[PDB]
Amino acid sequence: SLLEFGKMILEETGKLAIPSYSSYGCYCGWGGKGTPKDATDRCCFVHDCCYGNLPDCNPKSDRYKYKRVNGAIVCEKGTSCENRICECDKAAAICFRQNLNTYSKKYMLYPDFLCKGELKC
């Protein structure tokens, strides 16, 4: 759920999900339309797509358990949905960490009309 995802993000990047990754670019937060603005925005695009592969799961509210094995994020056994949701979140958290260097404040609160383009999962 958002609770685990938010904790994962903070632990990985030192940034709080809200407001750092909740209104960034075209896909971090709202999701919607267009072409991803940068690497961080692409991480959210892929994350949206990952959730998109789980039509009968409820990623925002279904809680999962995860632990740290000397740095590495390890998803613990739960229901199949919980396992898959955790893998999606884990990938996003790592992706955010991998692209922290290019994270740009100019993409925060990015306006909707500037999100144009075509990009299928």
Ligand X SMILES: CC(C)NC[C@@H](O)COc1ccc(CC(N)=O)cc1
**What three-state secondary structure class fits 100?**
helix
- 47 annotated active-site: yes
Report the nearest approach of ligand X to the CB of residue 89 (Å).
8
| Residue of 38, 56, 89, 112 marked active site | 89
35: left (phi over 0), alpha (psi -120 to 50) or beta: beta
Question: Total number of residues binding ligand X (CB under 6 A)?
Answer: 6
Question: According to the binding rule CB under 6 A, does residue 84 interact with ligand X?
Answer: no
Q: Side chain identity at 100, as an amino acid letter?
A: L
Residue recorded with tokens 């960490």: 97
Tokens of 7: 């904790």
- 38 annotated active-site: no
Question: Which helix (H) or strand (E) segment is 6 a member of?
Answer: helix 2-13
Would you give the binding string for ligand X spanning residues 5-34, x where CB under 6 A is met? x------------x---x------x-----
Tell me whether residue 29 is annotated as binding: yes
Catalytic residues: 47, 89
Annotated binding site for Ca(2+): 27, 29, 31, 48
